[PDB]
Amino acid sequence: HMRTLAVISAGLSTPSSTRQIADSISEAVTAAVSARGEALSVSTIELSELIPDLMTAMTTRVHTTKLEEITSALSASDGLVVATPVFKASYTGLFKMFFDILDTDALTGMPTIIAATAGSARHSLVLDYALRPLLSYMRAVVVPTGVFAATEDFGGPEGAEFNKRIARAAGELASLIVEES
Amino acid sequence: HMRTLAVISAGLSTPSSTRQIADSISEAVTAAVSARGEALSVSTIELSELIPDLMTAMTTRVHTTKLEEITSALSASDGLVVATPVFKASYTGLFKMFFDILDTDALTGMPTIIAATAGSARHSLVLDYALRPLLSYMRAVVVPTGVFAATEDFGGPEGAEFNKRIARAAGELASLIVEES
Amino acid sequence: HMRTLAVISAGLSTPSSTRQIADSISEAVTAAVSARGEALSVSTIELSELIPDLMTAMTTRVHTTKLEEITSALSASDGLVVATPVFKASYTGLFKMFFDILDTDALTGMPTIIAATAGSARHSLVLDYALRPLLSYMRAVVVPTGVFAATEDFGGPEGAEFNKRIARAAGELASLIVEES
Amino acid sequence: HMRTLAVISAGLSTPSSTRQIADSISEAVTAAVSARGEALSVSTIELSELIPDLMTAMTTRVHTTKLEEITSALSASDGLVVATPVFKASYTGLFKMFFDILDTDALTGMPTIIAATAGSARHSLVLDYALRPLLSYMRAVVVPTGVFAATEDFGGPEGAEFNKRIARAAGELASLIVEES
Incomplete structure (x- = not known):
């Protein structure tokens, strides 16, 4: 039925480091699900492009159609990857807001890889x-394997050990994804 | 020069429990600064009324005039009170977003009382x-005294012990406020 | 081969609320593994009875024989349950110390239920x-289902909803336990 | 009356990186209190030398005389510095245990600098x-200024910026210390 992977990226810049690693991870997850013999369809959502819909959901309990379809697709996914920039020593307000907007049971049981990016670690x-x-x-x-991309630490032994980690996180998720019947 | 107290409330409902306790606290802080012989001017900001400005700050590095004046006033304040509802077991995305938008040194040294509200504790x-x-x-x-309003726990010994706490938090802040020359 | 479940309890009083829920959970896990058609052997360790060994491990890199066998058994287990009292708004120093003493890879992949107890919630x-x-x-x-026993909240709708939760946590673990080949 | 500064170090190795920075900080605090015109008496306690007393306090509600005098002196201090190694991504069990052993109101109002050390940051x-x-x-x-010593990051711009930070943390504490009458 082709496994489905939702990806929520919350970067604001272009290029987006957040989207960069979110892609690194999703690519790795596709590679791992392939190795387990299946095809993985990855649907990525850039939160900066849902701003008006989120701004609307704050001043109106009713969600736009665009938003209603996105959260529904999300809940229906087999796996999930979430990535965020680090603002004020934590996740982004926009990032949190997206989750605030979700129904309480929207992600129950959802296999997930949590990721974040910043200059240092x-x-x-x-x-x-x-x-x-x-x-x-x-x-x-x-x-278990959370992914934290420290831009300043790419390349060399560190960078190679990092890509090794992304693969590890990818495997954990891939295993959970092909497990669901 | 009349001490100044900024208050950031992030509730979305009306009435707002968040604004309720934010008021309970600010009233208490005024009472305490009065006892220390001075007058306290409290300026409260409801974040739900800054949504378009915050939504704009997300898609434009430049802040609106309304926002530029609000953050400037904030940084200039003598004391600060911040209150938020608990969404998904933590502070509100809108709440965080407001802080994301602030300059790195916007609150350096700022005396502050942190507060939050929810049904249970x-x-x-x-x-x-x-x-x-x-x-x-x-x-x-x-x-030290953070204030957590559990709506379900108002009234009786608990409620009275709680108001006792708000006063304690108020005193700590008031002391720091009248200390600044 | 009879599934094995290690249980680490860190209570100090007798009776121990910590051991009480640790038992509630382990009993529930046995019931769930039974339902999945297998037998579960539960080995519980009371940390208060390993004090001299831990005190020794602090002043001597070498672990006693009693301790060496306990951690080895632990790492070999199929599942794990950890329970602790709440001292100074967090887990017990003795609890942490036990984990400090473990090798870095001692629990890699270990299926686990985290639990804690206190008067209120x-x-x-x-x-x-x-x-x-x-x-x-x-x-x-x-x-996902962590277990927090608030002694003051036992019995009635709450208590019954709580036992429902312990069963839920038990199922999650049981599923992971019978999954390992 | 000569200001008093208590220092709790929880390192286990010798030399102790924990004690190293704990000293760096206390030296800095003495320098700052001196600049404010007073003398600072610093009493440091190495937790690894209170092990038997702590081990005893775990299996006997009654504290030894040596321990009773140490906590009493602590509560009587004007300022406090606490330092710990990072075990299993957090503070040391021995460190926590010391605090578990304290009376609920032992540190109420106590001016404090929190510090920790590890290889990386x-x-x-x-x-x-x-x-x-x-x-x-x-x-x-x-x-506000917490001190985190990343051994790998000493020397150069970083190291010099770090010592700048320790001084900043020292000043904050020193100010609070000479403030108490």
Whole structure:
């Protein structure tokens, strides 16, 4: 039935480092699901392009049609990847807002990889102290390998060890994805 | 020179529980600064009324005039009170977004009381694991007594012990406010 | 081969509320693994009875024989349950110490249920902001349903909804346990 | 009356990086209190030398005499500095245990600098997500500048910017210390 992977990116710049790693991860997840013998369809959503819809959802309990279809598709997905820039030592307000807008049971059981990017790695704990508690509150199953891209640390032993990590996170998710019947 | 107190409320409903306690706190802070012999001018900002400006700041590095004046007034204040509803077991995306929009040194040294509201008190730790790290990252000095309003727990011994707490938090802030020359 | 479940309890009092729920959970896990057609052997360790060994491990890199066998058994287990009292708004120093003493890869992939107990539920977020980050740092897979026993909230609708939760957490773990070949 | 500064170090190795920075900080605090015209008496406690007393306090509600005098001196201090190594992505079990052993009101109002050390800085958020919530729960007033020593980052622009930070944290504390009458 072709496995489905939703990806939520919350970067604001162009190019977006957030979208960069979100892509690195989703590409890796496709590679892993392929290795497990299946095809993976990845649908990415850039939150900066849902601003008016989110702004509307704040001043009107009713969601636009565009938003209603996006969250519905999300809940229907087999796997999920979420990525965010680090603003004020944590996830982005826009990022959180998207999740605020979701129904309580929107991600129950949802296999998920949490990711974040920044210059250095001093704020990498944002993964376990911010995103993890969030996806956990929503009963999603967040794989152990969280991905934190420190732009300043790409290339060399570090960079290669990092790509090794993205693959590891990808495998964990891929395994959970092909497991669902 | 009349001490100034900025108050950021992020509730969305009307009436707003968030604004309710934000008021309870600011009233208490005025009472405490009065006791220390001075007058306190409290300027409250409802974030739900800055939505278009925040939505604009997300898709344009330039802030509106209305927003530019609000953040400037904020940084100029003597004290600060921040209040938020608890969405998805943490602060509101709109709340965070407001802070994302601030300059790095916007609140350096700013005396502050962090507050949050919800039905029960099971998510009260959001004060130390969400708001505290945030205002701390911005080098603001957050008073020890954080205020968490559990609507279900108003009235009776609890309610009276709570009002006692708001006064305590108010005193801590008031002391810091009249200290600045 | 009879599935194995390790249980780490860190209570100090007798009776121990911590051991009480640790038992409630392990009993529930046995019931769930039984329903999936298998037998579950549960080995519980009371940390208060490993004090001298832990005290020794702090002043001597070498672990006692009793401790060496306990951690080895742990790593070999199919599933894990960890429970702790809430001291100073977080997990117990003794609890943490036990984990400090473990090898870096001691719990990699380990299916786990995190649990904690206290009078009220105001410190229930300790599960996602303390224990979750900890077991996650050790690459253990912590099931979504964390268990927080608020002694004051036993019995009635709450209590019955709670037992419902323990069963839910038990199922998540049981599923992961019978999955390992 | 000569201002008093208590220092709790929880390192286990010798030399202790933890004690190293704990000293760097306390030296800086003495320098700052001197600049404000006073003398600072610094009493440092190495937790690894209180192990038997802590081990005893776990299996006996009664504290040894040595421990009773140490906590009493602590509560009587004008300022406090706490430092810890990072084990399993957070503070040390021994560190926490020391605080578990304290009376609820032992540090109310206590001016404090929180510090931690590790090779890299990827776990620096432990300051705001672990130590801050802890000292805050005890109503101590933790200065904004937390100190995180990343051994790998000493020397050069970073190292010099770091020493600049320690001085900043020292000033915040020193100001609070000479303020108490």
